[PDB]
């Protein structure tokens, strides 16, 4: 019993964190086999950030300009290449702590653990989700760039995010491990703003099923709804549309609790209309959207 | 920017988790040097233990079976002497924490770490954890520099869904016993010094709507706080909040008048750090650590 925001154990990722220095800029790198992956803006000065020409900046660099430090040991850079917004530094030593891993690009609504690092040293681990507007609501300070997001399903680490920047509203933007940004962002100091954010509907419904599994039923009702009527109501509260794929994904939790997805959609509509009335659901006074249907089944 | 419930990196603890089986019972153990620590309920405990032999305890570290060469009981923890020292044993200490203090939990099943979360020792000595059957022996910890301080070992779930356990010397937190009997957590209270620390974290992050021009005496604040089931605020707590008070320019008793108005009037449809409730599971040290980026 109980329901917590749970992160994956970070050990397999801690053994991969290194510090990367280029000129006056220092950030974090991910050392897997003989390659260190880091944001390409490590080659930039703050002056270069408005309109950097990364190809022009990188051709001017030599291997010995990149200072890589793994713990108290200096790694030797023997090559470099740029792949989208990530720099891949070939090193002379393979990481003996390299776990079984994959690079995965996630969709909005998906959750992952973040190992926040500074100077190649892990400082903390927290759980978060890719927002519908492609930002993450992280907890990051200057020097956290290169900190990674991951999932550990079984013994394989799936790296899905690398931190690159903080937007003016305090939210964060980054790329997958192939250097492709999530969202319409660029690694440039230019007028960029996150689009209006919305609530991850399929995740709130999963969390309502978690509340039912944990004994809480106060919010249930005798009503059902059509998917279209639910979406018409949900849009008004800045909730993401619920698709038939989401209804299908909620099938197992619906079968376990005996509450049809559209019946649970009707409790959600009522909660949006009424508020919580001094009550809580799983210790929260707000509707939680950072637990996927998969996370609920795994934890409960 | 941003404020998350953050746990310590769990790596140094993952390398210590093992599975312990005795008869039909399987739970988790903590392998430090040549000793495996686990809840004694895995087996009148001294009468039950005298009947056991070393080979009855099946200890598994990954895909390797460890040989038990001895055993002893210390309070509610069983200490299994093994023939192999853990090469991954980190620098560690066993520490007993106070209510209000926070720690990270590495939840395990079958000696395998499944998750890490951050939590607080409630004033009623329970923890609001997330645990299923088989989680027993999962440990709570903090990290100071490169030293792991083990402070909690999970033993059981109470009827209300909250959890109870011991320090690593086997002493329970709270008035609990490790047996099947009618036990209930006492009425819980809010950790006042922690809510104030989280209000300072909100100010540091740009959330100031709850600030007011007023101040209060410590006595008047405590008279009001005792009415809302909030823990008393001591002069030690006021002293501990000193650094955050100096950084934000808001005196502790000035922040108390804000908390008093929040208790009497409510949040009024507003949120603080994305929450509609007052959060009490961040200590003043956790706030300074997260808002400064201390590493391990
Ligand atoms: C001042 N106040 C907002 C405190 C927090 O300050 C910060 C300041 C910087 C942060 C950061 N770094 C960058 O954004 C660097 C950068 C700049 C332009 C483009 C790119 Cl691609 C990269 C990352 N994460 C968090 C950061 C919090
Ligand atoms: C509510 N229930 C239907 C679902 C959750 O099931 C549980 C069931 C058991 C849980 C558990 N184990 C024990 O309590 C075992 C035990 C029994 C009596 C005395 C002692 Cl000292 C130990 C630990 N942590 C979580 C547990 C969640
Ligand atoms: Cl995905």
Swiss-Prot record, chain A:
This is 3C-like proteinase nsp5. Residues 1-300 are cytoplasmic. Signal peptide: none annotated. There is a cross-link at residues 5, 90 (Glycyl lysine isopeptide (Lys-Gly) (interchain with G-Cter in ubiquitin)). Inhibited by pyridone-containing alpha-ketoamides compounds 13a and 13b. In turn, alpha-ketoamide 13b (tert-butyl (1-((S)-1-(((S)-4-(benzylamino)-3,4-dioxo-1-((S)-2-oxopyrrolidin-3-yl)butan-2-yl)amino)-3-cyclopropyl-1-oxopropan-2-yl)-2-oxo-1,2-dihydropyridin-3-yl)carbamate) inhibits SARS-CoV-2 replication in human lung cells. Inhibited ex vivo by michael acceptor inhibitor N3. Inhibited ex vivo by compound 11a and 11b. It comes from the Viruses. The gene is rep. The active site is at 41 (for 3cl-pro activity), 145 (nucleophile). It is found in: Host cytoplasm; Host Golgi apparatus; Host nucleus. It catalyses: TSAVLQ-|-SGFRK-NH2 and SGVTFQ-|-GKFKK the two peptides corresponding to the two self-cleavage sites of the SARS 3C-like proteinase are the two most reactive peptide substrates. The enzyme exhibits a strong preference for substrates containing Gln at P1 position and Leu at P2 position. Cleaves the C-terminus of replicase polyprotein at 11 sites. Recognizes substrates containing the core sequence [ILMVF]-Q-|-[SGACN]. Cleaves and inactivates human TRMT1, preventing tRNA guanine(26)-dimethylation of tRNAs. May cleave human NLRP1 in lung epithelial cells, thereby activating the NLRP1 inflammasome pathway. May cleave human GSDMD, triggering alternative GSDME-mediated epithelial cell death upon activation of the NLRP1 inflammasome, which may enhance the release interleukins 1B, 6, 16 and 18. Also able to bind an ADP-ribose-1''-phosphate (ADRP). 3CL-PRO exists as monomer and homodimer. Only the homodimer shows catalytic activity. Interacts with host FBXO22; this interaction promotes the proteasomal degradation of nsp5. Residues 1-300 form the Peptidase C30 domain. The chain holds residues 3264 to 3563 of 7096 of the full protein. Changing residue 132 to H: In strain: Omicron/BA.1, Omicron/BA.2, Omicron/BA.2.12.1, Omicron/BA.2.75, Omicron/BA.4, Omicron/BA.5, Omicron/BQ.1.1, Omicron/XBB.1.5, Omicron/EG.5.1.
